[PDB]
């Protein structure tokens, strides 16, 4: 029922991009939806890299939960908007690539951790503001 609606939304918006950024899957394996939003997500990643070089040090499940939760709760305590969801997505992807590249086997814990936070703390806002259709429109409007 609705447990599966939440799954497909999060996977299209969040998981697909992380798995591409991690090289768990190729660009060709991304849906047309995922290929579109990847552009605005890629540009956010570039814009972020020009500001800061994030150095991660995570050796356990708990460190991931605590650190990830601390960052993203401050990101949205103020408010929620699509631009910040872009940052949420990209942040999740960078922590996950650190894990896979460190070979610590924790990347699935980052994805899952971000999946759960988006599900409970962001999805109500996302859906009540047009959900998938509006994020795609947001990403196409940014193409200007």
């Amino acid at each position: 029922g609705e447990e599966l609606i939440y799954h497909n939304i999060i996977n299209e918006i969040l998981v697909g991009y992380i798995k591409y950024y991690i090289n768990d899957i190729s660009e060709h394996e991304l849906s047309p939806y995922q290929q579109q939003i990847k552009k605005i997500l890629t540009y956010y990643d570039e814009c972020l890299n020009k500001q800061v070089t994030i150095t991660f040090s995570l050796t356990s499940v708990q460190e991931i939960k605590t650190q990830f939760t601390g960052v993203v709760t401050e990101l949205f305590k103020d408010l929620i908007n699509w631009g910040r969801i872009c940052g949420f997505i990209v942040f999740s992807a960078k922590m996950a690539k650190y894990c896979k590249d460190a070979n610590n086997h924790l990347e699935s814990t980052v994805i899952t951790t971000a999946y759960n936070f988006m599900k409970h703390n962001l999805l109500p806002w996302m859906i009540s503001h047009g959900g998938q259709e509006e994020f795609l429109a947001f990403s196409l409007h940014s193409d200007m």
């Binding site: 972020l48 500001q51 910040r84 969801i85 872009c86 947001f138 940014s142």
Partner: peptide
């Protein structure tokens, strides 16, 4: 440094939100 990253994520987030 962690609170620094969340501030940065906010600004460039708000930036991308307005530029759309």
């Amino acid at each position: 440094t962690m609170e620094n990253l969340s501030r940065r994520l906010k600004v460039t987030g708000d930036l991308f939100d307005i530029m759309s």
